[PDB]
Structures are given as structure tokens and as C-alpha cells.
């Protein structure tokens, strides 16, 4: 379960 907002620079 990745958090996509941990780094918004990661697509």
C-alpha cells in the first residue's frame, strides 16, 4: 500500500 502523496514528485 504505497502512499502516493509521500512524495508527489514520484509518478
Amino acid at each position, epitope marked *: 500500500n504505497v502512499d502516493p502523496n509521500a*512524495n508527489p514528485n514520484v509518478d
Partner: antibody
Amino acid sequence: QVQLVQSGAEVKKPGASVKVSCKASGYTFTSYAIHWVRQAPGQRLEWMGWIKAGNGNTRYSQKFQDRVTITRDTSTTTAYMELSSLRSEDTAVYYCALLTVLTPDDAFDIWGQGTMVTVSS
Amino acid sequence: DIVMTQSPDSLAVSLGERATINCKSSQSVLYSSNNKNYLAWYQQKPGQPPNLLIYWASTRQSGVPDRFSGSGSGTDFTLTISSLQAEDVAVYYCHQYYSSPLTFGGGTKVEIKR
């Protein structure tokens, strides 16, 4: 020509506040999020938070939620981090960085030179 | 918090020899949906800011010499420098961007034996 230039070293008394600046340059400022990372002397990197340079939304580390504020000035292509209620333990180097902009074509990662902040009486 | 633990804290190897650095994460950083490890390796030469070497655990950043390589999966990862050069004096950090807060390892200091 892509770079982040931070403000200079500062000294503060305990209980005061410090505001570090990160002047961006060489890319479209509003496209990427700027992170703030601190490196205490002889220790690992500690992530503090990021701000989206476009819409200005932020996310802070729980370790620093109470007393960190990250802002951005779109007209001057500058990001700011303010740490308040400073303690001597906050003596560290503070970095702004475009951490890991990962796209299919490229990887893009840029750091500012760091700002040393000493908290002392 | 995903805790990142590097091993060893320091190593010394001769010029031209292989240096290996280890990093273990509390939780797995392998995402089942895309089968990618959300892990990077940074190099910090003295007095300079960190510099990105490896991302997705094993992809070299543009301009990184070929002797740097990254491997591992899930919770166990390795950075290898196949033939150490004088300019590789630095502290190396692993980094996870799988969950918030982003976290970094404690760092491994590489010394050159000449």
C-alpha cells in the same frame, strides 16, 4: 542552470524562530514539490515536509508538525521554511530539495547547498 | 515510520576493489501492483549536499558511473561499487519513498585504502 540557492547560516537563541529561504531557478517553479530535510551534526537525514510549488499545499512530518511552516512565493520562485520555538537540539543543516522527480523518461533530483542554523544562548 | 538500517556504519577498501553497503527496512517497500521497490541510494561527498545515485532500488541516475549498482528487493537491498575510485569518498544513504514520512538510513562512510 537548474539550481536551488538557500539563504546563509544563522544563529538564534532558544525559543526564537528561524526562516530559511530556497531560491529556485532554471525550471518551471510551479511544476514540482519542494522538500525540506534536516541533517543534525553527525546524524542521518531527517525529512521535515514538502510543499507543492503550484497550489501551495503542504505535508509535514509528525516530528515537526507543531512548529514548522512551509510556504512558497510564486512571484519570486522561492520556498520558505520557518521553524519556531527553537531548542538547542534544532542545531542542524537544513536542506531544500526536489527529491526524486521520477518520470518514465528521466529522473530529476536537485538539492540546495544547505543552511546551518545554530541555536544557542 | 519505515525504519532504515544500514550496515556497516563504515568500511575501508582498497582502490580498485569492490565495496558493498547493506540496507534493511522495517517494512517491505515492494509495491505488489507495479512490482517496483520504492527505494533510492544517495551519495554525500564531504561538505556537499546528497546526490542521487540509484532509484527504484536498481536504476542508475543519468551520469552516475557504471561501477555503481543497486540490487535487492522487499526489505533487503545492497549498493555495490564494483571498483572503488578515489572520488567515491562519501557517506552513502538509503532512502525509502514508499510511505510517509520519507525516511533515510543512518549512512555508511566509505574510506579508500591507498
